[PDB]
Design a protein around this ligand. Structure first.
Ligand SMILES: CC(C)S(=O)(=O)NC[C@H](C)c1ccc(-c2ccc([C@@H](C)CNS(=O)(=O)C(C)C)cc2)cc1
Ligand SMILES: C=C(C)[C@H]1CN[C@H](C(=O)O)[C@H]1CC(=O)O
Ligand SMILES: C=C(C)[C@H]1CN[C@H](C(=O)O)[C@H]1CC(=O)O
Ligand SMILES: C=C(C)[C@H]1CN[C@H](C(=O)O)[C@H]1CC(=O)O
Lengths: 85, 155, 83, 209, 51, 51, 51, 51
């Protein structure tokens, strides 16, 4: 049962986004929470790194309250970086 | 191997020794483990020091030399004597100190003796019987071996 | 001796900068992953040039030499009080 | 009066001979001392003894591609260290081991190590076990007709002991290097002063009579 | 004493099977990565009851 | 390996170490000799201790 | 942590170890105390000399 | 020899020594930051200890 890469990534972004949709206006505050849950649901090659790290960082630095949709739409294509380190 | 040839199994994972006869019928992956036919016996009780462990910390050369030195000092005294007794005392002092220290370095060896150091020695003696499994690559090795020693052992 | 106080260094960022939290989380990750430790060992200790003894001492015997000379002194004393 | 003289001198010579005995014990302990390097790991743990591999080949690449800790650290050290610990040829590396007074260690395959260890001047040796377990092989282009015959041949030679006998032929048989305590030399001096003392004794014995 | 002969074990596959080459490359990868070594050390030595 | 791949040689017989990178490009026969990465140093000399 | 996230408590003061997983959910003040994972064993008995 | 044996022996220095010996068992709490540290650890020694 391999987790591949891309499937894991698209899962990661999708779960992060879907999670952040639940918190309206607090979106910028809960990015790490939703990333945690997303890393749990989609699994990770490195527990510390998470499903997609670069996406997480992109979201954290970009996402502002109520700015969720555009921010995510911009951040989901970004390079995830090294999944093992 | 049989299950593999007749298609009762798709793959074989086991301590299967790579042999030419099996390599002719089947395909062997590169070896995942290295081994060889070896000899197993019962570990002996420690051989005990013996009396020679006492002559170990002082080489035989030192004993012969100290005896010749002793009789030389004796024949010197036989023919002033104060410096003889003094030099001899210094000598025996240095020697007993050196022996004490070296003995301390030596301690016990506590090493057991090995009856047979190699495969050939088993071929040379009938006292210790030896054998292999009822089948498998080892027995087949002994059977087909064209080498003198192994031939004798198989016989 | 020990340290007078216990404190630490840190990466500094302007208040309300977007980089602050990413930098912080990065430092935590590096800490737990042992990156900080290995880095410090790299620069400080690993190339460290400063890094038991079977050798003779003339000094240990000196005391007994002193008590010897003292004993000979007392010997001279007794030799004098006798004569 | 003379009693305390004899006593003090006796105590003095007592502590001195005891101390000599003990220190000598320490030196013989020094010769008894083992394990300067017992493993690959120890080279990773100490910076005093430099070590290296060939400029290219399977060993260097093994270290480069290795993700396991010790070898990784070793690779880091080797790549970063100056002057270069890498050598062009095997003979150059061995020569470096010989010239370095034991300050340089050379990482090379078990075969070459055993062979050089069996060759004069016989000043070199292999320490500890092997880092990895692998083998040589005869190489053939993919899809060549020679592959299976060659393979079966190598197997035949293996079971027949031809390979073994061959290695014994080239490695050990032609090898020029060949196959506890109580140093005599140290005692030789005290024997010499003994004979000297007896000589002086004969001298006095003659001048008296 | 030493060993009488020097040989090895192996994974066996039917001649012309599709699995053969993947298995082989897998054994090689495991070899270089030290998985085999770690495995033997796991089963043989690490739990070793003598000394 | 190059001479073999580009067909300037039909076979290669030499102390060629089996590596995954080489096993991917060419075919290796079963190993005819076993070895491993090892450490070499200069043997110490206890000779001529003196008086 | 749970009480903090779900708002059953306004602050948490305790020997709470700072971890990235916890730093993601909550906010940690600068460390008021330093620590590290360490090993504890039984101290050996000093002497039982007898004659 | 006796006097040597008394002082010479060192029971434990660092965690690595704990990793290298099976004689002295060792452990952590059922939960908390230490156990989680060992669990998530990709560092050799701690990995071995966790296993
Ligand atoms: C490169 C690695 C994948 S590996 O070397 O194949 N496997 C590692 C494993 C520890 C190992 C390493 C080496 C050997 C090994 C065993 C024997 C030999 C020679 C003496 C005979 N080769 S043979 O294959 O047994 C024979 C029947 C022709 C050469 C190499 C067997 C197993
Ligand atoms: C256990 C058995 C019968 C097997 C295991 N290896 C050898 C083999 O693979 O043939 C045999 C042992 C042997 O021949 O001594
Ligand atoms: C002697 C040389 C250059 C060859 C031999 N085996 C290794 C190989 O198959 O590349 C090389 C040595 C090494 O890499 O340590
Ligand atoms: C005492 C306990 C249960 C706490 C205290 N610090 C660690 C923590 O904050 O999780 C826990 C201990 C540990 O797991 O090492």
């Amino acid at each position: 049962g391999p987790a591949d890469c891309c499937r894991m990534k698209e899962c990661c972004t999708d779960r992060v986004n879907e999670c952040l949709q639940r918190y309206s206006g607090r979106e910028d505050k809960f990015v790490s929470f939703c990333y945690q849950e997303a890393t749990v649901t989609c699994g990770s090659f490195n527990e510390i790194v998470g499903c997609c790290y670069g996406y997480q960082m992109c979201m954290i630095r970009v996402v502002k309250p109520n700015s969720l949709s555009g921010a995510h739409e911009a951040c989901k294509t970004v390079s995830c970086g090294n999944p093992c380190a | 191997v049989g299950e593999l040839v007749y298609g009762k199994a798709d793959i074989a994972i086991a301590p299967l020794t790579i042999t030419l006869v099996r390599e002719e019928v089947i395909d062997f992956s590169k070896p995942f483990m290295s081994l060889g036919i070896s000899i197993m016996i019962k570990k002996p009780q420690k051989s005990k020091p013996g009396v020679f462990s006492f002559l170990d910390p002082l080489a035989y050369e030192i004993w012969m030399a100290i005896v010749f030195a002793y009789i030389l000092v004796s024949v010197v005294l036989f023919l002033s004597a104060r410096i003889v007794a003094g030099v001899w005392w210094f000598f025996t002092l240095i020697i007993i100190s050196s022996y004490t220290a070296n003995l301390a370095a030596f301690l016990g060896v506590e090493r057991m003796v090995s009856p047979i150091e190699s495969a050939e020695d088993l071929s040379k003696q009938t006292e210790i019987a030896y054998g292999t499994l009822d089948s498998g690559s080892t027995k087949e090795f002994f059977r087909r071996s064209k080498i003198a020693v192994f031939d004798k052992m198989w016989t | 001796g020990g340290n007078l106080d216990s404190k630490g260094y840190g990466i500094a960022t302007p208040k309300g900068s977007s980089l602050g939290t990413p930098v912080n989380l990065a430092v935590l990750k590096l800490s737990e992953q042992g990156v900080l430790d290995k880095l410090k060992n790299k620069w400080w200790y690993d190339k460290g040039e400063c890094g038991k003894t079977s050798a003779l001492s003339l000094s240990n015997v000196a005391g007994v030499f002193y008590i010897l000379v003292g004993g000979l002194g007392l010997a001279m004393l007794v030799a004098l009080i006798e004569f | 009066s003379a009693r305390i003289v004899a006593g003090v001198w006796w105590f003095f010579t007592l502590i001195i001979i005891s101390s000599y005995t003990a220190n000598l014990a320490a030196f013989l302990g020094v010769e008894r001392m083992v394990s300067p390097i017992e493993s690959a790991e120890d080279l990773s743990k100490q910076t005093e003894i430099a070590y290296g591999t060939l400029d290219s080949g399977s060993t260097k690449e093994f270290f480069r591609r290795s993700k396991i800790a010790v070898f990784d650290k070793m690779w880091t050290y080797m790549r970063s260290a100056e002057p270069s610990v890498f050598v062009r040829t095997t003979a150059e590396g061995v020569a470096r081991v010989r010239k370095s007074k034991g300050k340089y260690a050379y990482l090379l395959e078990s075969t070459m190590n055993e062979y050089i260890e069996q060759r004069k001047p016989c000043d070199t040796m292999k320490v500890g076990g092997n880092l990895d377990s692998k083998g040589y092989g005869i190489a053939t282009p993919k899809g060549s007709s020679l592959g299976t015959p060659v393979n079966l041949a190598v197997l035949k030679l293996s079971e027949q002991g031809v390979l073994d006998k061959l290695k014994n032929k080239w490695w050990y048989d032609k090898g020029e290097c060949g196959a506890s305590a109580l140093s005599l030399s140290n005692v030789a001096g005290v024997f010499y002063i003994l004979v000297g003392g007896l000589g002086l004794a004969m001298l006095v014995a003659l001048i008296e009579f």
